[PDB]
Amino acid sequence: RGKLIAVIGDEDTVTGFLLGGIGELNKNRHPNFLVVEKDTTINEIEDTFRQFLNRDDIGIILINQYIAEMVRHALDAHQRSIPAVLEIPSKEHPYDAAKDSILRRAKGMF
Amino acid sequence: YYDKHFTEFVPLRTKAKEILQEEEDLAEIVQLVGKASLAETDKITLEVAKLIKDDFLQQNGYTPYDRFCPFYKTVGMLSNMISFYDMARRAVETTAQSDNKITWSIIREHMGEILYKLSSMKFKDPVKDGEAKIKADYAQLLEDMQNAFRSLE
Amino acid sequence: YYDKHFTEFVPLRTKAKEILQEEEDLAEIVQLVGKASLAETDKITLEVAKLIKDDFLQQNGYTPYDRFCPFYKTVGMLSNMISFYDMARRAVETTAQSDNKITWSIIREHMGEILYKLSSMKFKDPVKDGEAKIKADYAQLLEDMQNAFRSLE
Amino acid sequence: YYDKHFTEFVPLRTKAKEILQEEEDLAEIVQLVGKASLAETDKITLEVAKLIKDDFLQQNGYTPYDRFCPFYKTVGMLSNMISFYDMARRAVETTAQSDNKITWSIIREHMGEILYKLSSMKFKDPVKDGEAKIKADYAQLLEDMQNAFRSLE
Amino acid sequence: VCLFLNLANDPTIERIITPRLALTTAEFLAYQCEKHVLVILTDMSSYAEALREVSAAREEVPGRRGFPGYMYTDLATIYERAGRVEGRNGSITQIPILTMPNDDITHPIPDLTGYITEGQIYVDRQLHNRQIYPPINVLPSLSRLMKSAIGEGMTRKDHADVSNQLYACYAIGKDVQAMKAVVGEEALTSDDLLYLEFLQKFEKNFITQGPYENRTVYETLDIGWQLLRIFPKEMLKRIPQSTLSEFYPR
Amino acid sequence: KDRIEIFPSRMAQTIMKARLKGAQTGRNLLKKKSDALTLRFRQILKKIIETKMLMGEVMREAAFSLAEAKFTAGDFSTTVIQNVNKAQVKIRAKKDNVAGVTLPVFEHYHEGTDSYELTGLARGGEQLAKLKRNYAKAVELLVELASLQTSFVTLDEAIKITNRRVNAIEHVIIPRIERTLAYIITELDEREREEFYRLKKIQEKKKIIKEKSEKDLE
């Protein structure tokens, strides 16, 4: 079977990847993304993250690097081998390796 | 006997055995995480342990220069290798936590000639060279390395 | 004899022997995988067997509290250690069917004082403490376990 | 004697002993790596080694088809099992580096009836079947083998 | 050839006499008639199993593993009837064949033979089961003296260099064959595939010979080069660049 | 505990030599596995760092390019976000089996249908065409990066499992066998001495009986 990528992020980043063709609705009408409006609570972000990592259709989750640091508890607690998670930069937000949970494991890294 | 005739040699022997033991201990770290991961002191310890293993302790007895090796030649060789070790280690440790810092590559760049001489000293020949000539070359390498390290720190 | 004077003992002897056997079976795996991969019931088995090994099987005969150990003290310690085992196992098995899963570490961190009381039972001394006093302390430990496990459910 | 009466048998004897030895090496490593490291030749080797071990070297002490096996039957069985090895191995090696490669799994599908026949060869009965009848059935298996491999090539 | 046969059912003391008889003849041919001699002894284990009987006949108490303690001397007194000698051309060379009991090198028969003799050669059950004849395993084998049998004037100048490099490539080939079985062919480098193709061709052309094909040292070295030519010139690391320049070309 | 306790016999010496060759072969086979896994693991780690370095600049260019669309197309973002049905790009899970272990990875796939094709037809469509292409390029690096992540994490666990087996062989199985083989060789030699002593004392009694039997002729 196939899988899809999913997004948790700001309106601009979500808009970008939607024109990049990322956007789809599950059969239950739920999207494969959350637009994190400034008014959104941490519980909506974390619930969406926990839904996306447990969902059958989603293979990869993309999280804006600043949102990844908000949801850091669940993001570091996620330790399944298959469903991947990516912390990504954005225009008013941090760089691509900020606190990165994978890079911090390696002995061979500089 | 060494106190009467070779009074510096007991220190040198002790330091040599320690440098070699440290090579075997450091080789585990090199096998785990590579030579690049070691401290500067430990990198220069592998370089001197290499000189000791490659040009002090090895001796090809078929060559005219190594048919035999007098004790004075043996002391002079080890004295220079460990004098280089102490001066390199002082230069590294004196620049610890500094902006500009000494390392094996700087030493090899600015005084790779002294590393070349420390190997080359094995070729000196008690049959063709007088004891004074041999001792003088060893004393000159001590002065050369001291000036060379003094130009860095 | 036990069926006439100590009707509780034969079950306790059986469970204690089994728990020690299961820990020695688990140990053969731990010695090649580490302490982490075991199921929580098996962690409880291993830790309880360590309590049985260190605070029941061991007895320091050159100290007043372990110089002698009557049968009523001996069976009372078993009743407490096995009551802990059955309740700790039951608490996991009752809740591992759900996200509200009790674990060996939850039990340990909620019951550290009860584990200390359990290990301390050897120090009770028939020279100073009456039989009823040792029994009453051990009965209080049984009640403390029951109320602590009821506080995890 | 074989070069007078059974000229094919010496090649078969050598190929048999080779396959049965390659099984010991492969059956060791698979305990630590599973199937994942095996080449298609090695999968074919294990399959034919299992056929030889289970359906040629295996023999029932107490049933008429196996109580005694004459040499005409014996060479015919081995000839088929090793002809499968050479043809299956050839099919892989012939399609290695191509846009599509014949695998052991493709072979296992398309040869399934031949594999059932190969394992069944042992049940042909020298009492109720004449040796010419057994040989004719075994020749039909060789023709069926050729036509089944021609589905792949 | 002079051939002595002692049958399995011949008198056990004649089995003791047979080596002493053969070597006495070989000493006559070598040291008096100036011959070069190769003395082949076919099973020293059957001799040890005879010396045990003569020892039991004198009611001597058995030594280690039931053999007489003095077997080291008796075995030496057999084997040391060998060598070249001052002012003579003659020389007894010797090959004591020896069936290791229970396949085990620790057994006193091979153990004492390894103390007296200069080296050993192994027949190997693995090569035998693979139908490689002769099944001589090169890796645990060692001709202790080989450095004075070979080279310029004695054979050809390349021989030691060839033998060292063939040994290294067979050792690395066995290691890479084990690696293939662990990692799969896709994980092998081009150089690994060379040591593995060398390994296959080496067993089929160098070790394999068949019972009646006779090869000179010279033909063996040329087969050696036909195998070593599989590698790049630079990969043949134990060989000197002069020997490669004279013999790597084919 | 410290030994296997097979009873001292020449059989047991053979079986313990065979068990030692077995365990030592197992160590060597698993050492090759650990080395091959270690090499791939360190390669993948460098590819992760490099892939993140590549991703950052492409993402910054894409994130700035959206502002150009926001300049000419207005708040097109609301129409984009509100109107969703089916993706133009999706993924498939795939495997490698190198060094005897399954490593999960992903591949990028394209479904043709542009669910935003007419967006900004009236104005801004030049900028929106650049914009879709920039993020559509970024996604393929993300699919690769995610594959490196899952591979790296799986290799780390496989190396730990392999090194536990290698060291359990080197520090538990081989030491039990070598200490057992020493006990077998020792007790085998004890039986050989006990036999030697009995045979020697028998031989002395026989010599006494022979000497007495000759003395009895007088």
Curated annotation (Swiss-Prot), chain A:
It is a peripheral membrane protein. It is found in: Cytoplasmic vesicle, Secretory vesicle, Synaptic vesicle membrane; Cytoplasmic vesicle, Clathrin-coated vesicle membrane. GO terms for cellular component: clathrin-coated vesicle membrane; extrinsic component of synaptic vesicle membrane; membrane; proton-transporting V-type ATPase complex; vacuolar proton-transporting V-type ATPase complex; vacuolar proton-transporting V-type ATPase, V1 domain. Keywords: Cytoplasmic vesicle, Hydrogen ion transport, Ion transport, Membrane, Synapse, Transport. One of its GO terms (molecular function) is proton-transporting ATPase activity, rotational mechanism. Expressed in brain (at protein level). One of its GO terms (biological process) is synaptic vesicle lumen acidification. It holds the Pfam family ATP-synt_F. V-ATPase is a heteromultimeric enzyme made up of two complexes: the ATP-hydrolytic V1 complex and the proton translocation V0 complex. The V1 complex consists of three catalytic AB heterodimers that form a heterohexamer, three peripheral stalks each consisting of EG heterodimers, one central rotor including subunits D and F, and the regulatory subunits C and H. The proton translocation complex V0 consists of the proton transport subunit a, a ring of proteolipid subunits c9c'', rotary subunit d, subunits e and f, and the accessory subunits ATP6AP1/Ac45 and ATP6AP2/PRR. Subunit of the V1 complex of vacuolar(H+)-ATPase (V-ATPase), a multisubunit enzyme composed of a peripheral complex (V1) that hydrolyzes ATP and a membrane integral complex (V0) that translocates protons. V-ATPase is responsible for acidifying and maintaining the pH of intracellular compartments and in some cell types, is targeted to the plasma membrane, where it is responsible for acidifying the extracellular environment. NCBIfam families: V_ATP_synt_F. Belongs to the V-ATPase F subunit family. This is V-type proton ATPase subunit F.
Swiss-Prot record, chain E:
It is found in: Apical cell membrane; Melanosome; Cytoplasm; Cytoplasmic vesicle, Secretory vesicle, Synaptic vesicle membrane. ATP binds at residue 144. Expressed in brain (at protein level). Coiled coil: none annotated. Belongs to the ATPase alpha/beta chains family. Non-catalytic subunit of the V1 complex of vacuolar(H+)-ATPase (V-ATPase), a multisubunit enzyme composed of a peripheral complex (V1) that hydrolyzes ATP and a membrane integral complex (V0) that translocates protons. V-ATPase is responsible for acidifying and maintaining the pH of intracellular compartments and in some cell types, is targeted to the plasma membrane, where it is responsible for acidifying the extracellular environment. V-ATPase is a heteromultimeric enzyme made up of two complexes: the ATP-hydrolytic V1 complex and the proton translocation V0 complex. The V1 complex consists of three catalytic AB heterodimers that form a heterohexamer, three peripheral stalks each consisting of EG heterodimers, one central rotor including subunits D and F, and the regulatory subunits C and H. The proton translocation complex V0 consists of the proton transport subunit a, a ring of proteolipid subunits c9c'', rotary subunit d, subunits e and f, and the accessory subunits ATP6AP1/Ac45 and ATP6AP2/PRR. This is V-type proton ATPase subunit B, brain isoform.
